[PDB]
Design an enzyme around this catalytic site. Structure first.
Site, short mmCIF file in Angstrom:
data_model
loop_
_atom_site.label_atom_id
_atom_site.label_comp_id
_atom_site.label_asym_id
_atom_site.label_seq_id
_atom_site.Cartn_x
_atom_site.Cartn_y
_atom_site.Cartn_z
N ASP C 25 0.75 -1.23 0.00
CA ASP C 25 0.00 0.00 0.00
C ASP C 25 0.79 1.30 0.00
O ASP C 25 1.27 1.71 1.05
CB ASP C 25 -0.91 -0.13 1.20
CG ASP C 25 -1.96 0.92 1.50
OD1 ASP C 25 -1.87 2.04 1.03
OD2 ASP C 25 -2.84 0.62 2.28
N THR C 26 0.84 2.02 -1.13
CA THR C 26 1.57 3.28 -1.28
C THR C 26 0.93 4.43 -0.50
O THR C 26 1.55 5.48 -0.28
CB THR C 26 1.67 3.66 -2.80
OG1 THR C 26 0.34 3.79 -3.28
CG2 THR C 26 2.38 2.64 -3.65
N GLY C 27 -0.32 4.33 -0.05
CA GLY C 27 -0.88 5.42 0.70
C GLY C 27 -0.66 5.09 2.16
O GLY C 27 -1.33 5.68 2.98
#
Lengths: 4, 99, 99, 4
Positions: C25-27
């Site tokens: 997950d990049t967020g």
């Protein structure tokens, strides 16, 4: 993480 | 081109002419924005995250200009603490996670 | 190699020998896992997400095997509904978001 | 979205  | 993830992957987008800072998030299924007004033609929704869930308004076929391209897609609005573009729009922008 | 985001970017990881399915997950700023036991040497934390915030336990220098590599890093444990590897570990795996 |  976000979901409906 | 690419984002090296030492900083938050954030860009500016125009939603129906309005400019917004958004986080590009691969762990989000969908997108949710605040502080933008988009119409009375919405469906009610609830999205769940880490600390619990929130109420949203789902708008279809919205006009979005980002990364030198104009796409149409589904946006929700609600009381999110940050604005998120989820996988639904990242696929439409031809993005992949590379290693 | 890469992940095309039409499906959730999910892989199996081994945390101190235990196997776990995780979402890349990049967020997420950080990583949080459940259902794994990691020791009494932790610091208390609270992480906030979409629906509110949760209590976590932060463990440093944990051993993680994923994508044919073994790295050491910070993992939190808490009552997350899904396990997340955030940017702190994705940088250590040499991942970028490409377009 | 997750943060401390």
């Amino acid at each position: 993480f976000l979901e409906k | 081109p690419q984002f090296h993830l030492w900083k938050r992957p954030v860009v500016t987008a125009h939603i129906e002419g309005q400019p917004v800072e958004v986080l590009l998030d691969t762990g989000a299924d969908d997108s949710i924005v605040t502080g933008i007004e988009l119409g009375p033609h919405y469906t009610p929704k609830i999205v769940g995250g880490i600390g619990g869930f929130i109420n949203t308004k789902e708008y279809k076929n919205v006009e979005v200009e980002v990364l030198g391209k104009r796409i149409k897609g589904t946006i929700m609005t609600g009381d999110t603490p940050i604005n998120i573009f989820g996988r639904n729009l990242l696929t439409a922008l031809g993005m992949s996670l590379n290693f």
